[PDB]
Amino acid sequence: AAGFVETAGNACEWTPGRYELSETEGRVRIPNGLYVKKEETSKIARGSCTFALTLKAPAGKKIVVRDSQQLISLRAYPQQTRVKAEVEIFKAGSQGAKQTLEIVAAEKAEKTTQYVGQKDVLLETACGGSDILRGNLSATIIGEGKGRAFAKNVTLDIQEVDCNLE
Amino acid sequence: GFVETAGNACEWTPGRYELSETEGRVRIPNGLYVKKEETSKIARGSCTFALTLKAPAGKKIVVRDSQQLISLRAYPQQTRVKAEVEIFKAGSQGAKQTLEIVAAEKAEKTTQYVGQKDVLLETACGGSDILRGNLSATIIGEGKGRAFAKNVTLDIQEVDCNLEH
């Protein structure tokens, strides 16, 4: 419940650094919100915000992380602008599933606002154990028009569970 | 109101089907099955649908909240499995979503719902529109792999035209 998060990258909306864990409404907010913008003066914009969440389970206790949810809003303006967000959460040393969301403005403005996340268990420490949960989040805007990719902080269900069997 | 499906990896025989509302949600039979053995380095498959929706008299048809269960399995070594799905009103843009896993030295799996919560299509009053859906998977690498998508379900509702703009 009481671990810590490191964020990094050139497109974090909130200043990258080390943050403390705080549970808002049973769900933990990780400050990995992302902001990437492109004008007509450039043919490409890219940005990323990554986090490393170190979780230490108390002795005889287990920490479990599930059900990530991140609100992603893509806006593309004509002509011929593509906006794509890629998100990936995983236990350090393990593989994860990668999700992407993309729109294209051809002749008129286009938008999409969606939640992206994995409903299932994302991480589970050993009893009294420690693990690191990482997350890559990135956006790429390519084309002739203006564009923006905005992601709100990801939220996670993190809960301490009783180790009480074998 | 009817749906036509097409494609080389549709699980159910591509053809013309009539729509029926199961629990207020319509199932489009665009389920996809794509498998790759160790005998080839790549497998690709797709299933697409065209759903023609005609609104009656002074009424409008509204389609929202798509949902498709996608299940990916990848086996080592260095094999990736990817699904891409896109629903959109014909002639308009849609948002494209992808789900992908990569087995390195260990087997990998993921099972997710993929869908758009917001309105996907809205006819004019007494109007006609076509909802299109592309769904496809790619398996790449030396190991075995499988991409399985269950049929898409959709919230389709008739609404009374009783205001004026």
Is residue B99 in a domain?
yes
Closest C-alpha to B53, from B7, B117, B121, B155: B121
b (16+ CB within 10 A) / e for A56-74: ebeeebbbbbbebebbbbb
Nearest CA distance, B73 vs chain A (angstrom): 11
Is residue B122 in a domain?
yes
Please answer yes or no on whether A118 and B102 come within 8 Å at the CB atom: no
What residues have CB less than 8 Å from B163, skipping those under 6 apart?
Answer: none
b (16+ CB within 10 A) / e for B36-71: beeeeeebebbbbbbbebebeeebbbbbbebbbbbb
Establish if B78 touches chain A: CB-CB under 8 angstroms: no
Q: From CA A14, how far away is CA B164, in angstroms rounded?
A: 45
Please answer yes or no on whether B93 and A101 come within 8 Å at the CB atom: no
- Residue A166 amino acid letter: E
Compute the CA torsion angle B85, B86, B87, B88 (nearest 10 deg). 180
CB A119 within 8 A of CB A70: no
- A99 interaction partners in chain B (CB closer than 8 Å): 97-100, 112
- B118 interaction partners in chain A (CB closer than 8 Å): 112-114
Q: From CA A6, how far away is CA A132, in angstroms rounded?
A: 11
Nearest CB neighbour to B117, from listed A114, A118, A119: A114
Number of domains in chain A: 1
Establish if A115 touches chain B: CB-CB under 8 angstroms: yes
Please answer yes or no on whether A118 and B110 come within 8 Å at the CB atom: yes
* Residue A49, domain extent: 4-162
Is residue B165 in a domain?
no
Structure method: X-ray
Nearest CA distance, A97 vs chain B (angstrom): 5
**Beta strand A130-143 with A98-105: parallel, antiparallel or unpaired?**
unpaired
Q: From CA B104, how far away is CA B86, in angstroms rounded?
A: 28
Tally helices (H) and strands (E) across chain B: 0, 13
Q: What is the resolution of this structure in A?
A: 2.2
DSSP labels for A99-131? EEEEEEESSS-EEEEEEE---SEEEE--TT-EE
Is residue B127 in a domain?
yes
